């Protein structure tokens, strides 16, 4: 079975405000380089070999970018394919106009276009097919999380979530968010069946990933008014299981706010991004050549630096 | 004579240029001269010219281009032992060397220009064309440093080197010939010219290099050397005392051990210091 993934170039939520208005979010330059060329190369690197393209806010754009991007070409081992529509208006139509086409077939993965990573896949995509033929239509979602610190600046409020996980088997029992709350609420139907192995996580950073499946669309065209994933989630966990992966030595990301952007732009320039780095070039262009050198300075072709100004830290 | 005045002549059109490439344009243009037809007497009324060329310059560079052009006109005999086209062929091959040995210079400063860093600082004994050639491609490529020069007390040609740099818009800087102890710490790299490459791979410069290699290599400092092909000589001097008089003469030149040297920039390409004697022993000089 083929690996495939499907791509939302559109953030149904304006936080970019005023930039997001004469150029989309998902082409702002992070590191001279946009975010769906990383989310693109994390999916080329994971060993996707199809992708499905969703725009709907300036997608003409989008369109016109990819199509001058390296992944269009013929010589690409995943064959992107650009989705337009007007009507999209959250993440649920989506999934609900992918399970009216019928493009998927398997464990697909469920990406924003604009997430930064590095994480590889194989792992948790192999524990959740194993979970799966064991259990043949249970275990529909797998969300990806990397293990951080709370006083991380990566960590920011808008997105901070905490879980109620199994440690025996990884199992989400309960997923719930703490954007402006201060004690934290956690019901008694977690402690039902088994009631030895549970816990509670704060250590993570939801990166926006999730190994979804065919069936996952399906309860999106059953359930009318799921209109994101968050959501998805709450409503399946009320009530097929949800489970997680969590990574310790990969990093992963979403864009989602400027307090996030100002995150990853300060990782992906001090290397914690590898091998994605501004001295890689990873989108085989030529005006985004560079040199890394010492104190992880950055100088591209024609820089003509003057004399007197010192270059003292992480600069691009 | 033609020899004293020719040389002179060949020295004054173009100060720039060194004494030895002088000294072997000479010598091919008195190669036209020549009227005898036995080889002998090529060889000999040549050898004086060269040795009597070496008596009114005192230099290593001198003798080893006289060395080398009486060693190339032995490979030219060792042809047919003919004389008879031996001495035309002897005269292309000759222009071709001269126009060889004239890019010198460029093949040099392009293949040492590569070592400067930007940022870094140099430090330069006395005056040489070729270490000015290596100082101005690096800033001709978008490089900044700074560099100490020694003022070569025997003769005032390291304010003579400063001036010349300073014009080329580097921040230059004098020091003392009893200094090169006290800014060895501030310098990240020591690069200067040779004027005759021993057998082993030492070399015969200014009074004041031996000692400022010993304290490049008592702080672990790069002691780069930048030569040409020409002024390899075949001397194999054990201590300050082995080396000629002649080219001594308060003397005017020392000799430092190949030990202290980290590598060497010649028209052959980046040397280390046992590669030379190689060559050397290539040639059978």
């Known amino acids: 079975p083929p690996l495939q993934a499907v791509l939302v170039a559109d953030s149904f939520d304006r936080r970019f405000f005023p930039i997001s208005k004469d150029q989309p979010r998902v ?69 609900r106009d992918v ?3 019928a493009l998927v077939r398997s464990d697909f993965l469920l990406v924003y276009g604009d997430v930064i990573s590095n994480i590889n896949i194989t792992r948790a995509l192999e524990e959740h097919r194993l979970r799966r033929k064991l259990e043949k239509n249970v275990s529909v979602m797998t969300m990806i999380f990397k293990e951080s610190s709370p006083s991380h600046p990566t960590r920011c409020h808008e997105d901070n979530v905490v879980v109620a996980v199994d440690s025996t088997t990884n199992r989400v029992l309960h997923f719930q968010k703490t954007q402006g709350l201060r ?54 966990l009320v009530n097929n299981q949800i489970h997680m992966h969590v990574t310790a030595k ?21 290397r914690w991004v590898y091998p994605l780095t501004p001295e890689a070039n990873f989108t085989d262009s030529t005006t985004q050549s560079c040199t890394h050198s010492r104190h992880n300075i950055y100088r591209g072709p024609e820089v003509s630096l003057g004399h007197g100004s010192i270059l003292e830290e992480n600069v691009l | 004579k033609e020899l004293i005045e020719y040389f002179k002549s060949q020295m004054k059109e173009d100060p720039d240029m060194a004494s030895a ?41 001198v003798s080893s281009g006289g060395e080398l052009f009486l060693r190339f006109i032995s490979l030219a005999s ?33 293949l040492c220009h590569t070592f400067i860093k930007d940022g870094a600082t140099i430090l330069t004994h006395a005056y040489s064309r070729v270490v000015l050639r290596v100082l101005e491609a690096a800033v001709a490529a978008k490089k900044r440093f700074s560099v100490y020069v020694t003022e070569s007390q025997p003769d005032l040609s390291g304010k003579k080197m400063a001036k010349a740099l300073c014009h080329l818009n580097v921040p230059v800087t004098v020091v003392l010939d009893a200094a090169v102890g006290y ?84 028209d052959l390409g980046v040397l280390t210091p046992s590669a030379v004697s190689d060559e050397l022993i290539k040639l059978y000089l």
């Open chain 1, 99 to 101: 399970d009216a086409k």
């Open chain 2, 78 to 110: 060792l042809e047919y032992s003919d004389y008879s086209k031996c001495k035309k062929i002897m005269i292309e091959r000759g222009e071709l060397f001269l126009r060889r040995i004239s890019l010198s210079r460029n093949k040099i400063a392009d």
């Open chain 1, 250 to 270: 990969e990093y992963g990301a979403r864009v989602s706010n400027l307090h996030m952007y100002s995150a990853v732009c300060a990782d992906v320039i001090r």
């Open chain 2, 183 to 266: 800014i060895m710490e501030k310098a990240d790299l020591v690069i200067v010219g040779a004027e005759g490459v021993v057998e082993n791979g030492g070399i015969i410069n200014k009074i004041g290099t031996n000692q400022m290699a010993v304290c490049a290599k008592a702080q672990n400092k790069p002691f780069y050397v930048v030569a040409e092909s020409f002024k390899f000589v075949r001397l194999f001097p054990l201590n300050q005392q082995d080396v000629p008089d002649k080219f001594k003469y308060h003397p005017w030149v020392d000799y430092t051990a190949p030990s202290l040297i980290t590598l060497l920039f010649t």
């Open chain 2, 21 to 61: 490439v002088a000294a072997i344009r000479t010598l091919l243009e008195f190669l036209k001269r020549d009227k005898g037809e036995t080889i002998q007497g090529l060889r000999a009324n040549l050898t004086s010219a060269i040795e009597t060329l070496c008596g009114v310059d005192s230099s290593v560079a």
């Open chain 1, 183 to 236: 004690r934290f609420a956690f019901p008694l139907s977690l402690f039902q069946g088994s009631s030895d192995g549970v816990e509670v996580r704060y250590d993570l950073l939801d990166c926006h990933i999730s190994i979804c499946s065919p069936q996952v669309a399906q309860l999106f065209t059953d359930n009318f008014d799921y209109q994101t994933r968050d959501d998805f989630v709450r409503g399946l």
């Open chain 1, 27 to 95: 082409l702002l330059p992070l590191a001279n380089v946009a975010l769906i060329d990383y989310t693109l190369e994390f999916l080329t690197a994971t060993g996707v070999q199809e992708t499905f393209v969703f725009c709907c806010w300036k997608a003409a754009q989008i369109k016109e970018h990819l199509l001058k991007s390296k992944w269009c070409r013929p010589t690409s081992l995943n064959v992107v394919r650009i989705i337009t529509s007007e009507l999209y208006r959250s993440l649920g139509d989506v999934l």
